[PDB]
Write a protein that binds this ligand. Structure first.
Ligand code: FES
Ligand SMILES: [Mg+2]
Ligand SMILES: [Mg+2]
Lengths: 98, 220, 133, 111, 25, 232, 6
């Protein structure tokens, strides 16, 4: 039987290391006008804008290339004991995955 | 009625896992559903620290070995309450999962409340529903926090009304007043779908088991 | 009805005490189930506290040996132009292949960080992966 | 307040009165209708009061008494509708249906 | 069990950048 | 019958609580007025209820009319009942020293027949709870609401002998002078027994109260202590 | 609002 420690050790997300400036493959799962919600295997999805070039190709189920900046966007504000989370990841949409 | 009680309502309480909820999930399944992913170290709640395996690059990881035991207890309790024909109410203010939770509650023949929670629904149910209304016997929180990252008022209200609660508690949640907390990821759709699947399956199996037991008892 | 003091004891203790005291005529439907299969912790209200002074959370940072290797890789060859596919549970990055080869040589050879690094790079080029410093 | 027994007695009284009115007017009780009731009551109890409600009227008791008090749970106490505890089961059920249809369509003068 | 995490300083930390004149008189 | 004084509302019985909307009857519960105050007009009442078998509560009621305030306070009190643990159903399990806001309460467990030698409000609450033998001293600000809150908090946070036995995994053995050297085991752990004895603390680091020691040594000289009083 | 109606 494989223990949770082994699973965490051999997990691709763990293998990735720091998330800054890492190329990942995400999948579009929801669209709102020109807004694409993309899941790349992390805890949160990332919300990107439909590119002005070949924008029709970006449809639900589409595979896209992303450059991660932060897995979860949080920040501590003045007079707060806990971070405020926007419940979203930060990523840059590069293009379609051929 | 003594024989009825002793053979139907008391017999299931003598077995460790009467409804076989241990086979509904494994640590591998919870890992695949990303149940171990928590929030940043900055959003951590103190009372959730004993459930946290560690912080991987400032991201909290939930200990799935503990999630397994807590989920086993919660599922066993939910199955036993569904066996006794108790009213089960799911609650969640995450709008991304409202439709799924209402569909699941409709499917398992239980109740859902995914909308705005009006003050006094539980502590003043008698005025808002009627003098003879029956309150839930168990409340399951798939999300314990409201849209302001403050605890759902139903947690404290159900504690006041002496109603047991099951609850999916993320690393930023407060598990003190949830009777059966289950540490786990409450954001990713895979995890929430897994939780809904497990609870629906447990309730359905418990109800079928109750009907089977009653039929057998009537026959013999 | 029972006691509405949610901050005194738990629902189990309150219900049990009221039942013994004769206030409640009958046990609620959930009481027997709770008694037979109790939770790991009794659900008692506790007020969260802010830590001060030298008190620190006992949550450790998750680190592994190979992380060190990974760091050097990400600092020398940079992030691989290949994209991560985190959906595949058995995905192998270029960095992961480098780490595996490094550990293999280390277990079949001596322990010199720079020598292992250069030999591993030479090998990975031998299998035929591009590695632009 | 009108108990259900009271309403039941009103229904049976109304049916007996319907057959009596059919007897008086010479019509066949089996096919005797509410419009016939209205016409017959207008003839037998003529009234020129301008207020339409003020005239004598013979309605089915459900039309008269407020019967919106429908029970939402059975004898065991379990509510019938899975959205009962929201307090607006009808409105939220309708919203749920509309949202489901919108999901399906996404997967695929008058006022 | 060998798969548990081990204690170490953060290896993913960039060593502090040296000013252009570091080591020069 | 009168209350603590001829013209005082405190101590007066209000009768049983009304049958609650829940459908329960509370004929075995008794109610006592602890305070009536004019709010500037309306009336604020602090009342306590109890069945004499460990279940007791208190509540505040505010209303323009005094009787409405009584009813509100009583009905709300019956739905916020504490359960108080009693040693042999006559006294508390151990000495309890507490401070609620600026009020201090020192309560001492006492043998049978000792009586309730306590603040009059404490006597009323103890009679409602069912405690028959206790000593109590109130210090600091004598504020009735703070007194009631602190009393109920301290009485609800007492550790029984069984709880101590389970915590320490050891027999709780009681020694009585009237019973000689006979050891009376009052509680045994439900789980296994530890085989290692408790550390024989040569001198415990306990926080002693100067008044108690002064009384023990005979240096207390109050003309007001140990005065003959009516049975309580 | 991506979840309009919930
Ligand atoms: S680091 Fe300051 S001169 Fe070198
Ligand atoms: Mg969350
Ligand atoms: Mg006088």
């Amino acid at each position: 039987v494989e223990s949770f420690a082994s699973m965490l050790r051999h997990s691709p997300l763990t293998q990735m290391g720091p998330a800054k400036d890492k190329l990942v493959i995400g999948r579009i799962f929801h669209i709102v006008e020109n807004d694409l919600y993309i899941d790349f295997g992390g805890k949160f999805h990332c919300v990107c804008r439909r590119p002005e070039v070949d924008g029709e190709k970006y449809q639900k189920g589409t595979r896209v290339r992303l450059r991660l900046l932060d897995l979860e966007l949080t920040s501590r504000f003045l007079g707060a004991t806990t971070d405020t989370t926007v419940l979203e990841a930060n990523a840059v949409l590069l293009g379609i995955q051929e | 009625s003594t024989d009825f009680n002793d053979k139907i309502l008391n017999e299931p309480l003598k077995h460790s896992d009467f409804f076989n909820v241990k086979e509904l999930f494994s640590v591998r399944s919870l890992f695949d559903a990303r149940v171990h992913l928590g929030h940043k170290a900055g959003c951590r709640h103190r009372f959730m620290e004993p459930y946290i395996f560690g912080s991987r690059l400032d991201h909290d990881i939930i200990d799935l070995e503990q999630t397994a035991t807590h989920l086993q207890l919660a599922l066993n309790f939910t199955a036993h309450m569904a066996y006794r024909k108790g009213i089960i109410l799911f609650i969640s203010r995450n709008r991304q999962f409202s439709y799924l939770i209402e569909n699941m509650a409709r499917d398992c023949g239980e109740y859902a409340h995914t909308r705005y929670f009006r003050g006094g629904m539980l502590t003043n149910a008698r005025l808002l529903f009627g003098p003879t209304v029956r309150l839930p016997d168990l409340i399951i929180f798939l999300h314990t926090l409201n849209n302001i990252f403050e605890p759902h008022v139903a947690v404290r209200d159900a504690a006041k009304m002496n109603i047991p609660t099951v609850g999916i508690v993320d690393t930023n949640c407060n598990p003190c007043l949830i009777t059966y907390p289950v540490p786990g990821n409450d954001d990713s759709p895979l995890a929430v779908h897994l939780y809904c699947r497990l609870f629906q399956t447990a309730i359905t199996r418990a109800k079928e088991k109750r009907q089977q037991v009653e039929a057998l008892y009537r026959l013999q | 009805a029972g006691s509405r003091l949610e901050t005194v004891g738990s629902i189990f203790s309150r219900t049990r005490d009221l039942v013994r005291a004769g206030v409640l005529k009958e046990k609620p439907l959930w009481f027997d189930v709770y008694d037979a299969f109790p939770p790991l912790r009794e659900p008692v209200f506790q007020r969260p506290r802010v830590r001060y002074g030298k008190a620190k959370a006992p949550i450790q940072d998750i680190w592994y040996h190979e992380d060190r290797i990974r760091a050097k890789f990400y600092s020398v060859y940079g992030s691989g132009q290949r994209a991560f596919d985190l959906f595949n549970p058995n995905f192998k990055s270029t960095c992961q292949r480098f780490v595996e080869k490094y550990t293999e040589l280390q277990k079949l050879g001596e322990t010199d960080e720079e020598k292992l690094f250069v030999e591993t790079g030479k090998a990975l080029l031998a299998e035929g992966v591009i590695l632009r410093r | 307040t009108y108990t259900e027994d009271f309403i039941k007695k009103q229904i049976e009284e109304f049916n007996i009165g319907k057959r009596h009115l059919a007897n008086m007017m010479g019509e066949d009780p089996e096919t005797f209708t509410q419009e016939d009731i209205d016409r017959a009551i207008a003839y037998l109890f003529p009234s020129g009061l301008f207020e339409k409600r003020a005239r004598p009227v013979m309605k089915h008791p459900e039309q008269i008494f407020p019967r919106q008090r429908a029970i939402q749970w059975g004898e065991d106490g379990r509510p019938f509708h899975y959205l009962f505890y929201t307090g607006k089961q009808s409105y939220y059920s309708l919203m749920h249906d509309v949202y489901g249809m919108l999901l399906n369509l996404e997967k695929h003068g008058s006022r | 069990n060998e798969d548990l995490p081990i204690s170490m300083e953060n290896p993913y930390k960039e060593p502090l950048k040296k000013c252009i004149l570091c080591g020069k008189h | 019958e009168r209350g603590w004084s001829g013209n005082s509302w405190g101590g007066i019985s209000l009768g049983p609580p009304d049958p609650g909307p829940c459908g329960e009857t509370y004929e075995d519960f008794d109610t006592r007025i602890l305070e009536v105050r004019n709010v500037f007009k309306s009336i604020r009442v602090l009342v306590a209820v109890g069945n004499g078998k460990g279940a007791a509560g208190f509540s505040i009621g505010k209303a323009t009319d005094r009787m409405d305030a009584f009813r509100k306070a009583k009905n709300r009190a019956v739905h916020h009942l504490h359960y108080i643990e009693r040693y042999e159903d006559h006294t508390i399990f151990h000495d309890i020293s507490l401070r609620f806001k600026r009020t201090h309460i020192k309560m001492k467990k006492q043998p049978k027949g000792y009586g309730l030698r306590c603040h009059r409000a404490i006597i009323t609450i103890c009679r409602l709870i069912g405690i028959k033998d206790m000593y109590a001293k109130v210090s600091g600000s004598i504020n009735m609401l703070s007194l009631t809150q602190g009393l109920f908090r301290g009485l609800s946070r007492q550790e029984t002998h069984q709880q101590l036995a389970d915590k320490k995994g050891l027999h709780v053995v009681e020694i009585r002078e009237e019973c000689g050297p006979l050891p009376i085991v009052v509680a045994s752990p439900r789980g296994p027994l530890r085989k290692d004895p408790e550390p024989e603390d040569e001198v415990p680091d306990v926080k002693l109260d100067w008044e108690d020691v002064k009384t023990a040594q005979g240096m207390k000289r109050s003309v007001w202590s140990n005065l003959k009083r009516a049975a309580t | 609002d991506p979840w309009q109606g919930c």
